[PDB]
Amino acid sequence: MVYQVKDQEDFTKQLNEAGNKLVVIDFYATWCGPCKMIAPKLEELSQSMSDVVFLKVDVDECEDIAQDNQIACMPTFLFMKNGQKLDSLSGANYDKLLELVEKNK
Amino acid sequence: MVYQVKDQEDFTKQLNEAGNKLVVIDFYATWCGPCKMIAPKLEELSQSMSDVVFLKVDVDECEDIAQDNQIACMPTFLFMKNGQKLDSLSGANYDKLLELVEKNK
């Protein structure tokens, strides 16, 4: 299940609730084609991988969060663990996403 | 100066107002660092070149325009002339931007 972050406070809570699990964050916009293309794949992955936390941030709803993470090319996937940045992926390359998940959990 | 497109009707109005001139449209977001860094360069180009018209579209304010032009990266530059799309440029690559301007104007 890919949880939709409501705001900065909610974002912090989710990163805390993750504990020591890898967190994958999808920064997306509803007007972005590639974002909508990869969203179902992220949902499917999140249903199987109970040991990775999957989040999504709508940049139009959470502009403050988008600005904090230097987002530019969408979708952007940020990889975090224990509240700390590990990696980042620009674009909807599912194979690269899997390689980064494999590396980082 | 770079005119901010207000909506879809305003976009058509600006494209008409440009006459035969090349139009460069900057799709941007206020949360995007690279957009902010190149914005002043576009202002200078706008003030300097009288045979090119420069426009900007805030994707947060005109999500419909963003979707219809299939923006995915910020900033994205669309190059139009007499209503026709000639080229597109993803990212804040000023040299490539200048290149597409000299070529299409």
> How far are the Cα atoms of B31, B41, B46, B56, B65 from residue B1, in angstroms, in the given order?
21, 11, 5, 10, 21
Chain centroid to Cα B68, Å, comes to: 14
Q: What gap in Å lies between CA B53 and CA B11, rounded to an integer?
A: 12
Tokens of B49: 């070149």
Please provide the DSSP assignment of A29-86 as one string: -TT-HHHHHHHHHHHHHHHH-TTEEEEEEETTT-HHHHHHTT--BSSEEEEEETTEEE
Distances (CA, A) of A18 to A9, A24, A50, A52, B49: 14, 10, 11, 8, 53
Residues in chain A: 105
Specify burial of residue A97 (Cβ count, 10 A radius: 0-12, 13-18, 19+).
buried
Rounded CA separation B95/B105 (Å): 15
Active site residue A73: no
- What kind of experiment solved this structure? X-ray
**Which single residue is written with the structure tokens 């997306």?**
A28
Phi, psi for residue A17 in degrees, rounded to 5: -65, -20
Resolution (A): 1.8
Domains, chain B: 1-105 (3.40.30.10)
Residue of A15, A35, A38, A55 marked active site:
A35
Nearest CB to A70 within list B33, B64, B71 = B33
Residues A23, A53: Cα–Cα separation, whole Å: 5
Bridge partners of residue A4, in order along the sequence: A56
**Pairing state between β B22-28 and A76-81:** unpaired
- β B22-28/B76-81 pair status: antiparallel
